[PDB]
């Protein structure tokens, strides 16, 4: 069993490197952030441009959706996060507190909290309603590349250039686990699996790893792509077959059979590093995005 992803739409508009792409949970929209200090909203099924959201003073590294698809959270080099009401385009809150670039962000499933990570080596937990910082965790000894909440929001997974993945108790802020393989390459990305038993981590030694968090064991390894420098997102594709999807420094989208770990498809088309990919929550759609030499988002579909 192999998928058949084929290019359907190319989305131009960003004037600088695209940093992240995310589909709304309701499946209606695609959000993109860029080094151009802007967030763009696109139609998930046709790639039709909807709107631009601006206000950040420097490049945006990440964007994330709230569970009801009404809010966006963005992380910027202007050392803030911003909470946006998508429909009205308004900036609800500006989260000030990090001392360096904010590199990653996410909402919890209940979307009353925001987790953020920064070049200041900390993980912060914010109140969505007030925009106040509830906890500052002295999480790592190098920049925090990714942060993500589990299925019920009781755990936060963080990764850093220091070579570690750490699991934090949302309520106490105590470190529950430190995950590392025998090698120490910088960990550029991490995320909990859709149902939360696993963690998918990306290292800067051209490797994707699937860990069983509880047992502290690496269960699967996915190789064949190139990733020695950039914080490339990776994803679980679960609408058709069960796959692992990731961008690559060789300008391709790689797709792996999750169980067998073999490459099932490679998507050719971008002219620069595929920095980010996203999988549609209900349809076999992959959104992919590239750096400065390309500046486009591509929408691929499988039948
Ligand atoms: C179905 C979809 O996602 C799945 C993705 C998945 C699928 C399979 C394996 C896995 C792990 C170890 C060995 C092997 Cl042979 C497979 C790992 C992840 C998921 O989240 N499973 C999940 N999370 N927590 N507990 N079960 C969804 O939940 O919509």
Swiss-Prot record:
Gene Ontology terms, MF aspect: histone binding; histone H3K4 methyltransferase activity; histone H3K4me1 reader activity; histone H3Q5ser reader activity
Coiled-coil annotated residue ranges, if any: none
Subcellular location field: Nucleus
Site features described as Important for interaction with histone H3, chain residue numbers: 77, 103, 233, 292
Glycyl lysine isopeptide (Lys-Gly) (interchain with G-Cter in SUMO2) cross-link, renumbered residues: 16
WD repeats: 13-52, 55-96, 98-138, 139-178, 182-223, 226-266, 269-303
Modified residues (N6-acetyllysine): 82
Keywords from the UniProt entry: Acetylation, Chromatin regulator, Host-virus interaction, Isopeptide bond, Nucleus, Repeat, Transcription, Transcription regulation, Ubl conjugation, WD repeat
Record annotation: effect of changing residue 195 to A: Loss of interaction with RBBP5 and reduced ability to stimulate KMT2A methyltransferase activity in association with RBBP5 and ASH2L
Cellular component annotations (GO), alphabetically ordered: ATAC complex; histone acetyltransferase complex; histone methyltransferase complex; mitotic spindle; MLL1 complex; MLL1/2 complex; MLL3/4 complex; NSL complex
Subunit structure, as described in the record: Interacts with PAXBP1; the interaction is direct and links a WDR5-containing histone methyltransferase complex to PAX7 and PAX3. Interacts with HCFC1. Component of the ATAC complex, a complex with histone acetyltransferase activity on histones H3 and H4. Component of the SET1 complex, at least composed of the catalytic subunit (SETD1A or SETD1B), WDR5, WDR82, RBBP5, ASH2L/ASH2, CXXC1/CFP1, HCFC1 and DPY30. Core component of several methyltransferase-containing complexes including MLL1/MLL, MLL2/3 (also named ASCOM complex) and MLL4/WBP7. (Microbial infection) Interacts with herpes virus 8/HHV-8 protein LANA1; this interaction regulates the MLL1 histone methyltransferase activity on viral DNA.
Similarity remark: Belongs to the WD repeat WDR5/wds family.
Official protein name in the record: WD repeat-containing protein 5
Gene expressing this chain: WDR5
């Amino acid at each position: 069993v192999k998928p058949n992803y084929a290019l359907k739409f190319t989305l131009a508009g960003h004037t600088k490197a695209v940093s992240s792409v995310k589909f709304s949970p309701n499946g209606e929209w695609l959000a993109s952030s860029s080094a151009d200090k802007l967030i763009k909203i696109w139609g998930a099924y046709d790639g039709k441009f909807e709107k631009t959201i601006s206000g950040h003073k420097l490049g945006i590294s990440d964007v994330a959706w709230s569970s009801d698809s009404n809010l966006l959270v963005s992380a910027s080099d202007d050392k803030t996060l911003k909470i946006w009401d998508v429909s009205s385009g308004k900036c609800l809150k500006t989260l000030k507190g990090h001392s360096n670039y904010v590199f990653c962000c996410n909402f919890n499933p209940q979307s009353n909290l925001i987790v953020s990570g920064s070049f200041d080596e900390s993980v912060r937990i914010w109140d969505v309603k007030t925009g106040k910082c509830l906890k500052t965790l002295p999480a790592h000894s190098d920049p925090v590349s990714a942060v993500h909440f589990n299925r019920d929001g009781s755990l936060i997974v963080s990764s850093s250039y220091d070579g570690l993945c750490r699991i934090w108790d949302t309520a106490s802020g105590q470190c529950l686990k430190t995950l590392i393989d025998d090698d120490n390459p910088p960990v550029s990305f991490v995320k909990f699996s859709p149902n939360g038993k696993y963690i998918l981590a990306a290292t800067l030694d051209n490797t994707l790893k699937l860990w069983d968090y509880s047992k502290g064991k690496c269960l699967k390894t996915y190789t064949g792509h190139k990733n020695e420098k950039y914080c490339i997102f990776a994803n679980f594709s679960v609408t058709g077959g069960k796959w692992i999807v990731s961008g690559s420094e060789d300008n391709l989208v790689y797709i792996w059979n999750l169980q067998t770990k073999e490459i099932v498809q490679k998507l050719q088309g971008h002219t620069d590093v595929v920095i980010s990919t996203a999988c549609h929550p209900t349809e076999n759609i992959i959104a992919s995005a590239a750096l400065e030499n390309d500046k486009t988002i591509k929408l691929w579909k499988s039948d």
